[PDB]
Amino acid sequence: GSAKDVKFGADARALMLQGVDLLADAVAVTMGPKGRTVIIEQSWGSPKVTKDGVTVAKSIDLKDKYKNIGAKLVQDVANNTNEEAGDGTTTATVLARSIAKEGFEKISKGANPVEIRRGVMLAVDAVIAELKKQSKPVTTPEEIAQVATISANGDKEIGNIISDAMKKVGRKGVITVKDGKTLNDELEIIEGMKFDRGYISPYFINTSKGQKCEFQDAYVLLSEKKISSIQSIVPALEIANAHRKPLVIIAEDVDGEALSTLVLNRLKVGLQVVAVKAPGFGDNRKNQLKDMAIATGGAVFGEEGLTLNLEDVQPHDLGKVGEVIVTKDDAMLLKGKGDKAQIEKRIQEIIEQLDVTTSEYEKEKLNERLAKLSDGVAVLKVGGTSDVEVNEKKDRVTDALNATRAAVEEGIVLGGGCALLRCIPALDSLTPANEDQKIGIEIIKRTLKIPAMTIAKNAGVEGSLIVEKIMQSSSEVGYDAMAGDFVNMVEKGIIDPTKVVRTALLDAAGVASLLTTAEVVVTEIPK
Amino acid sequence: GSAKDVKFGADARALMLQGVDLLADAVAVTMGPKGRTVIIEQSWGSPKVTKDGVTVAKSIDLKDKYKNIGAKLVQDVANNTNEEAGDGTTTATVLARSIAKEGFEKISKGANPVEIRRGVMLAVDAVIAELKKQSKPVTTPEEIAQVATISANGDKEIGNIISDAMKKVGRKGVITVKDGKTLNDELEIIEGMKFDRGYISPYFINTSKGQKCEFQDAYVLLSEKKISSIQSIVPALEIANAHRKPLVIIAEDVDGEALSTLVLNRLKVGLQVVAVKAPGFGDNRKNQLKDMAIATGGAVFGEEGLTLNLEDVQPHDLGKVGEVIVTKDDAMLLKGKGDKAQIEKRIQEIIEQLDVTTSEYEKEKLNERLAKLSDGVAVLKVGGTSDVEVNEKKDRVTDALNATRAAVEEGIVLGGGCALLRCIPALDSLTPANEDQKIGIEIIKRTLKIPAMTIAKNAGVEGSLIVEKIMQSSSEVGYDAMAGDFVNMVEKGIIDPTKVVRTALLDAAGVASLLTTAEVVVTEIPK
Amino acid sequence: GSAKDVKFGADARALMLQGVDLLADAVAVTMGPKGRTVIIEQSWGSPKVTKDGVTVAKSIDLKDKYKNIGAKLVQDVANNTNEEAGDGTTTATVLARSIAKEGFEKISKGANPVEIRRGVMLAVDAVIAELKKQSKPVTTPEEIAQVATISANGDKEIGNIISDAMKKVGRKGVITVKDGKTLNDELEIIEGMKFDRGYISPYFINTSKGQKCEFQDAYVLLSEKKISSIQSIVPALEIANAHRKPLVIIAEDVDGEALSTLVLNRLKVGLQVVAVKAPGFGDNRKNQLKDMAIATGGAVFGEEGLTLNLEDVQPHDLGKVGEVIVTKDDAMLLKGKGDKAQIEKRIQEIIEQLDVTTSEYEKEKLNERLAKLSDGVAVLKVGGTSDVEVNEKKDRVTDALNATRAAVEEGIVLGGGCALLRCIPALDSLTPANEDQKIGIEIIKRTLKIPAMTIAKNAGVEGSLIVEKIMQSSSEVGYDAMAGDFVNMVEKGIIDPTKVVRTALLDAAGVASLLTTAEVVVTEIPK
Ligand SMILES: Nc1ncnc2c1ncn2[C@@H]1O[C@H](COP(=O)(O)OP(=O)(O)OP(=O)(O)O)[C@@H](O)[C@H]1O
Ligand SMILES: Nc1ncnc2c1ncn2[C@@H]1O[C@H](COP(=O)(O)OP(=O)(O)OP(=O)(O)O)[C@@H](O)[C@H]1O
Ligand SMILES: Nc1ncnc2c1ncn2[C@@H]1O[C@H](COP(=O)(O)OP(=O)(O)OP(=O)(O)O)[C@@H](O)[C@H]1O
Ligand SMILES: [K+]
Ligand SMILES: [K+]
Ligand SMILES: [K+]
Ligand SMILES: [Mg+2]
Ligand SMILES: [Mg+2]
Ligand SMILES: [Mg+2]
């Protein structure tokens, strides 16, 4: 309907590259141990100071729509890297810039950019195979502290506290971050649980800073049957809201009308309510349901055995937590007010079920239920004197936790951009199908030198000399941009998770090689 | 009522041609195996990268209204080709440009453009007769894989998975495309329903991306009679209001008051409901509704035998699907929660009904019911690392599926624009009625060289030499624009569906020859 | 109340002439067999391509209000000709231009434009008398096919299908046009009826393309008395709400409150309802009511005999149609779901009423009822590959049907503007009263050569030489602008209805001679 502006050829590509270059030049100053921060003006209050790459990327939009298309594409790169890795967004941004630039620099009349994209993706597949080859598994908590220290801009306190947090709880344990009122950071180990079901509707969010629903001292409603009917929720809503306590709803499947009633009470009069789907695809659903009802003090409704209905609800059947956090993909309960004796009875029942099971698949479910009910969670309270320092350190702690989880789950490689420098001979052993595929392979081969060059460039030295010196050294020797020396990267602790590196490379390559294939760009006429 | 700007003669034609040329120049870069992509700015979020011609055509509007008229007419060409064939929109666009240009150039004082249009339509009828003459029936699954590979920009994975899909579900089976969370594509065979009735009111759409109504884990309400009264729908709406699963309504005819109440609940409070007309005409309608109620677990209301009324409705009388998709022209049911024993009993009843029928018209209806209840549905999940790559690959997969359906419907011809090049000697034998019909025949004869020239142009070579060498070669020799050589197009698999080619040519010719009959263009004064 | 701009003398006349000349120059390009089309931009999407003169006229408005007055006056000419003839609007437009121009030219100080207007109307009366003298009745269906072929821009397919439609249904039978989904046109004979009562309130219009009410599978409510009371329509609207079929209300006189209730349900919630007055006056009214009730299956309410009231209405007392079309001046029922045996019994009752009567005035009413029950309805479905093609052919099909009806009603004359050329000696036999009547007679005498000149001018030749060659030839020799030769017009089939020609001439002359009497033009100052 709206009038459109259409551009052709290399002018649209030049404008798109200009937007890509603006956003990636703003992001690339944050890279490494000599990286600097970015101040982002906030419309409501105090401005935000950050070193996190996706926060810099999301904050940038341009009036020029042709530049804004490239800005949005690199934003998609940074957002995908933050979503499936939680770290390495600056690396993905500079890799995407390099692929987009070297792809725009190689488009001619006889060139086929789709075959160039095929070559690019084939070369990235080769490099990810070599990354999986070079990777080694994390076996010592010293490496855990090293990963969390490197990912938190060389903060040894953050790495030590994260290593202690998963020493006390679990390498696959639940570790959370929140604001602290003290100057220094602290770690508290408290009882809690966490399951992988998020909210059902996005209208429940009352905290637009982390897109999550946050209540304190709220009721919790467990049910084996789907909490559906009007006479299933309206007595429940009356009992919950009328008691001066908010309501958390756990049920199997919630789709249709009563959530729209919940939204009508949330948006008009402001009812503090949230609904979460129940985890479990069988008897484990009922088992975890009963475990959370025991830990919270509430009961289970719609069950097969007792047949407790949601019409006749009483206040002494609703569980009480001290805190609940409901995100898009996961929800969690904190400090349930259930009886300690009943919790101990359920823990001993789980032990006696673990003593009579040998199928090696229900045993890990019972062990997960025991780890949920028994050891609790970890909470990092981040110190500082103002909210801007707390927010910047919180971003660093989130990066360090994400990287540490990725290094537990997939392993580690060499840091400082050296693990991409070591994958060049794998591209030197490829045989291209045709010339455009060779162009794509050479594009990826030149792109693999970019993160180390950016790290060294932020350190005030010439990155190409550094990178040449790294390629002429042995396989364990890279650059330490904090110290300014060429060292053994493993024994000095400069290591990266393999998952973060491969996620950044793949998410950069796909979007940037799709951007290279363009010939015509269509934007709207600005009004 | 509004003030108008009126232009006469060749100035209005020149401006209209200018709009046609802008839209078709944006579309023509996408053609062939060396075609490039088009980035379209999206107002909400990330921009859209596409190679599909009708998306580029529909994304372009102009401020100049005289140019916008030609843009809308070529957009109508592309839309009609996408509706009637699902493929070949870029070819229809370049053919429409060629006919519009050659018709605008041929208009003089003594010329009759309506007789020129008559000549155009006569020549296109001749060329479509020759296309139906040259067509060969697809009798190998290798040809299936070749068609789906060519239509998906030379992607052998998409062609292989589509060929395997209709190896599993049948050539006239149903294959669907949806988003995938993995990197690579995969094929899943579910048991599901699909019939050729769409939604009745257009207010039922929730997802505005494909103009379809999509629910998951939804109730299903079937009635042999029309769901007709407020006291028929209000028990059903109170069940879907309380028991909280989306309501899918299968009824004979729905036009009046209760659907307006349904729209009122759709728009004000947001009731997730959809209504679909019943398929079939006669006892086949009742048989299909009984089959659907058996497969979903629900019952049939308003029947002649049992006389189960729509006033007394129970929760255990509604079917439960796992997913429902209702588009404008067809609807679909996924994972009906019916009894397996009841479904098997209905399948054996259908077998025993097939064993006592010999009229050869009810036998194909019974076989269609058997393939509905037994053969199932096919699901293609499209992989990728970002939504833009997934969306562009989904466009290519939809093109390949549409072209494979057209090739099992009407056979195949030569690819690369060669089947239009082979119809020139058919035009070299028509005798024109008069001079203007001769002009129209020559316009079509020059237009028949255009798709091959555009394909060769996008491949970096000069297309007139290519077309001249194809026309001097044998009937089985065309250009391989991917390989840059002259090959056997049947042996190398470069083949097009006949239906796509004739649909594109007819839809281009009609609108372009109607455009070239215009002396006066009336537009609105811009405010 | 608004401030006004007032102009005097020949400047205002020149500006009005300018508007008349703009609209008539846009319309005159469409005239004849070598006429061209006009593209009109539509705000809701695809533009309209047309050759119909009144469609071009109604689409043109000017910003300068002095030109807009003349444009709207020629719009009144074209609209009146389209209303009382259905054809000849381009001829009326060019005649009105000629009279307006030659009247503005002849205005001097001593001239009286009102006696000039009297001369104009006297001369037009003479020419219409000579047209009625030259007219010949249509006796052969070859002339029917010739009229419908000429009126549809010279294709024999529309003429052949229209001639076959009144061979199957009759020359006074009803023939309707709707869009077809096929490429080619086809003729369908359906059983239906048609009376001359339109809608009663204009709020019932749902389809704003032809200002008509369009329902399918609709209830029908017939009453012999006026459907007046609230408790007469609340059971009926309750049944329409409780059964989901649009209510078609047929009653005697409908003026008051319950139609305002119908409008309130039409606009707020959307009740599909329409009310039509009952045709006939007296016993014929109730006879047609009983015929339509026994044809649709419903009953008659408020009757004298059975006394069936509108308070107690049952679902088995409403008729069911398959299609109903309610326009401004007439309504029409298609596919009534009545008993075939009851319809046959009413047919034999009508035959046995015909066999005992000789009054020769209600016998034609009985024959009309028999035709409404037995003769049927022709439906012309228009083919094409796009909606612009379908609309452009549908305008010509409507023009050909209108012309064929006018040629059945009043006969035929020579085509190509020759029947106006043959009326010049009749004007050469008048004796004017004074000199201004002589001026008006000479104005009409010069105007009578304009349609043939415009036809020849659209054919690329000089129209004045053609017209001078026509007047020197015999009375049966005129120009054939398609073939460019002078032929026998009756033998070659180039014929026009007499009614169309006289309607166009009279409607042009009245408005143009009223326009040429103006000394002062008062417009509004634009804001
Ligand atoms: N002392 C060091 N010497 C050399 N390289 C280092 C050193 N410390 C960290 N690095 C490297 O710097 C990179 C970390 O940069 P940074 O954390 O700013 O960006 P990122 O991981 O791409 O993205 P994000 O902004 O999301 O954290 C990693 O490649 C890491 O190996
Ligand atoms: N390797 C090839 N060599 C030559 N011609 C080819 C080759 N592969 C495909 N073609 C031809 O290119 C055309 C396909 O182009 P493309 O799919 O981009 O456009 P389209 O079918 O006109 O429209 P749409 O954009 O809707 O898909 C067909 O005529 C096909 O035969
Ligand atoms: N082959 C022909 N040779 C000469 N005159 C012809 C021929 N065919 C049609 N005509 C004449 O052309 C006129 C028809 O023109 P046209 O139908 O375009 O306009 P119209 O009847 O004035 O109005 P409308 O736009 O409503 O159709 C008639 O006078 C008809 O007799
Ligand atoms: K950073
Ligand atoms: K294309
Ligand atoms: K005309
Ligand atoms: Mg980091
Ligand atoms: Mg294609
Ligand atoms: Mg006409």
mmCIF file with all atom_site columns, C-alpha atoms in Angstrom, chain C residues 264-324:
data_model
loop_
_atom_site.group_PDB
_atom_site.id
_atom_site.type_symbol
_atom_site.label_atom_id
_atom_site.label_alt_id
_atom_site.label_comp_id
_atom_site.label_asym_id
_atom_site.label_entity_id
_atom_site.label_seq_id
_atom_site.pdbx_PDB_ins_code
_atom_site.Cartn_x
_atom_site.Cartn_y
_atom_site.Cartn_z
_atom_site.occupancy
_atom_site.B_iso_or_equiv
_atom_site.pdbx_formal_charge
_atom_site.auth_seq_id
_atom_site.auth_comp_id
_atom_site.auth_asym_id
_atom_site.auth_atom_id
_atom_site.pdbx_PDB_model_num
ATOM 1  C CA . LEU C 1 264 ? -30.205 -1.551  13.584 1.00 0.00 ? 264 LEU C CA 1
ATOM 2  C CA . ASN C 1 265 ? -29.516 -5.290  13.368 1.00 0.00 ? 265 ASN C CA 1
ATOM 3  C CA . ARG C 1 266 ? -27.888 -4.776  9.945  1.00 0.00 ? 266 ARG C CA 1
ATOM 4  C CA . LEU C 1 267 ? -25.417 -2.102  11.045 1.00 0.00 ? 267 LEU C CA 1
ATOM 5  C CA . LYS C 1 268 ? -24.548 -2.972  14.657 1.00 0.00 ? 268 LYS C CA 1
ATOM 6  C CA . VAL C 1 269 ? -24.437 -6.790  14.619 1.00 0.00 ? 269 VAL C CA 1
ATOM 7  C CA . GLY C 1 270 ? -24.927 -7.556  10.904 1.00 0.00 ? 270 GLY C CA 1
ATOM 8  C CA . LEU C 1 271 ? -28.258 -9.267  10.278 1.00 0.00 ? 271 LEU C CA 1
ATOM 9  C CA . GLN C 1 272 ? -28.444 -10.561 6.703  1.00 0.00 ? 272 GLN C CA 1
ATOM 10 C CA . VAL C 1 273 ? -31.967 -9.374  5.890  1.00 0.00 ? 273 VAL C CA 1
ATOM 11 C CA . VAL C 1 274 ? -33.762 -7.635  3.017  1.00 0.00 ? 274 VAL C CA 1
ATOM 12 C CA . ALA C 1 275 ? -37.351 -6.457  2.531  1.00 0.00 ? 275 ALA C CA 1
ATOM 13 C CA . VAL C 1 276 ? -39.086 -6.163  -0.854 1.00 0.00 ? 276 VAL C CA 1
ATOM 14 C CA . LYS C 1 277 ? -42.577 -4.890  -1.650 1.00 0.00 ? 277 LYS C CA 1
ATOM 15 C CA . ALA C 1 278 ? -45.014 -7.364  -3.196 1.00 0.00 ? 278 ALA C CA 1
ATOM 16 C CA . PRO C 1 279 ? -45.611 -6.916  -6.950 1.00 0.00 ? 279 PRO C CA 1
ATOM 17 C CA . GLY C 1 280 ? -49.110 -6.614  -8.351 1.00 0.00 ? 280 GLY C CA 1
ATOM 18 C CA . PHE C 1 281 ? -52.272 -4.726  -7.424 1.00 0.00 ? 281 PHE C CA 1
ATOM 19 C CA . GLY C 1 282 ? -55.213 -6.752  -6.138 1.00 0.00 ? 282 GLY C CA 1
ATOM 20 C CA . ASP C 1 283 ? -55.888 -10.415 -6.877 1.00 0.00 ? 283 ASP C CA 1
ATOM 21 C CA . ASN C 1 284 ? -52.731 -10.581 -9.003 1.00 0.00 ? 284 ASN C CA 1
ATOM 22 C CA . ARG C 1 285 ? -50.687 -9.562  -5.944 1.00 0.00 ? 285 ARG C CA 1
ATOM 23 C CA . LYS C 1 286 ? -51.970 -12.433 -3.790 1.00 0.00 ? 286 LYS C CA 1
ATOM 24 C CA . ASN C 1 287 ? -51.795 -14.775 -6.805 1.00 0.00 ? 287 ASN C CA 1
ATOM 25 C CA . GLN C 1 288 ? -48.090 -14.031 -7.321 1.00 0.00 ? 288 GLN C CA 1
ATOM 26 C CA . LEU C 1 289 ? -47.559 -14.331 -3.556 1.00 0.00 ? 289 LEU C CA 1
ATOM 27 C CA . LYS C 1 290 ? -49.133 -17.802 -3.579 1.00 0.00 ? 290 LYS C CA 1
ATOM 28 C CA . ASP C 1 291 ? -47.082 -18.755 -6.656 1.00 0.00 ? 291 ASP C CA 1
ATOM 29 C CA . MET C 1 292 ? -43.811 -17.695 -5.024 1.00 0.00 ? 292 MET C CA 1
ATOM 30 C CA . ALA C 1 293 ? -44.774 -19.419 -1.762 1.00 0.00 ? 293 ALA C CA 1
ATOM 31 C CA . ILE C 1 294 ? -45.562 -22.695 -3.529 1.00 0.00 ? 294 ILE C CA 1
ATOM 32 C CA . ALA C 1 295 ? -42.357 -22.322 -5.574 1.00 0.00 ? 295 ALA C CA 1
ATOM 33 C CA . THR C 1 296 ? -40.074 -21.669 -2.584 1.00 0.00 ? 296 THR C CA 1
ATOM 34 C CA . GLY C 1 297 ? -41.905 -24.084 -0.266 1.00 0.00 ? 297 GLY C CA 1
ATOM 35 C CA . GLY C 1 298 ? -43.082 -21.494 2.259  1.00 0.00 ? 298 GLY C CA 1
ATOM 36 C CA . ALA C 1 299 ? -46.563 -20.266 3.097  1.00 0.00 ? 299 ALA C CA 1
ATOM 37 C CA . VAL C 1 300 ? -48.502 -17.018 2.821  1.00 0.00 ? 300 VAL C CA 1
ATOM 38 C CA . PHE C 1 301 ? -49.207 -15.144 6.052  1.00 0.00 ? 301 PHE C CA 1
ATOM 39 C CA . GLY C 1 302 ? -52.035 -12.728 6.807  1.00 0.00 ? 302 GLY C CA 1
ATOM 40 C CA . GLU C 1 303 ? -54.309 -14.351 4.233  1.00 0.00 ? 303 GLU C CA 1
ATOM 41 C CA . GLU C 1 304 ? -58.078 -13.950 4.188  1.00 0.00 ? 304 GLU C CA 1
ATOM 42 C CA . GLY C 1 305 ? -58.853 -17.664 3.855  1.00 0.00 ? 305 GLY C CA 1
ATOM 43 C CA . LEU C 1 306 ? -56.618 -19.641 6.205  1.00 0.00 ? 306 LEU C CA 1
ATOM 44 C CA . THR C 1 307 ? -55.706 -16.636 8.435  1.00 0.00 ? 307 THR C CA 1
ATOM 45 C CA . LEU C 1 308 ? -52.149 -17.699 9.250  1.00 0.00 ? 308 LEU C CA 1
ATOM 46 C CA . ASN C 1 309 ? -50.702 -15.055 11.556 1.00 0.00 ? 309 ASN C CA 1
ATOM 47 C CA . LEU C 1 310 ? -47.179 -13.663 11.778 1.00 0.00 ? 310 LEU C CA 1
ATOM 48 C CA . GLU C 1 311 ? -47.054 -14.138 15.560 1.00 0.00 ? 311 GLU C CA 1
ATOM 49 C CA . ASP C 1 312 ? -46.903 -17.958 15.327 1.00 0.00 ? 312 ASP C CA 1
ATOM 50 C CA . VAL C 1 313 ? -44.276 -18.762 12.681 1.00 0.00 ? 313 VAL C CA 1
ATOM 51 C CA . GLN C 1 314 ? -42.733 -22.216 12.221 1.00 0.00 ? 314 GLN C CA 1
ATOM 52 C CA . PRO C 1 315 ? -39.506 -23.242 10.414 1.00 0.00 ? 315 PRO C CA 1
ATOM 53 C CA . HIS C 1 316 ? -41.593 -25.210 7.881  1.00 0.00 ? 316 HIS C CA 1
ATOM 54 C CA . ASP C 1 317 ? -43.436 -22.064 6.726  1.00 0.00 ? 317 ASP C CA 1
ATOM 55 C CA . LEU C 1 318 ? -40.451 -20.171 5.263  1.00 0.00 ? 318 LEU C CA 1
ATOM 56 C CA . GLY C 1 319 ? -39.361 -20.631 1.674  1.00 0.00 ? 319 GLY C CA 1
ATOM 57 C CA . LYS C 1 320 ? -35.793 -21.484 0.709  1.00 0.00 ? 320 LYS C CA 1
ATOM 58 C CA . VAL C 1 321 ? -34.055 -20.013 -2.340 1.00 0.00 ? 321 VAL C CA 1
ATOM 59 C CA . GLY C 1 322 ? -30.594 -20.802 -3.637 1.00 0.00 ? 322 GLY C CA 1
ATOM 60 C CA . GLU C 1 323 ? -29.882 -17.220 -4.708 1.00 0.00 ? 323 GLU C CA 1
ATOM 61 C CA . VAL C 1 324 ? -31.642 -13.863 -4.378 1.00 0.00 ? 324 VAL C CA 1
#
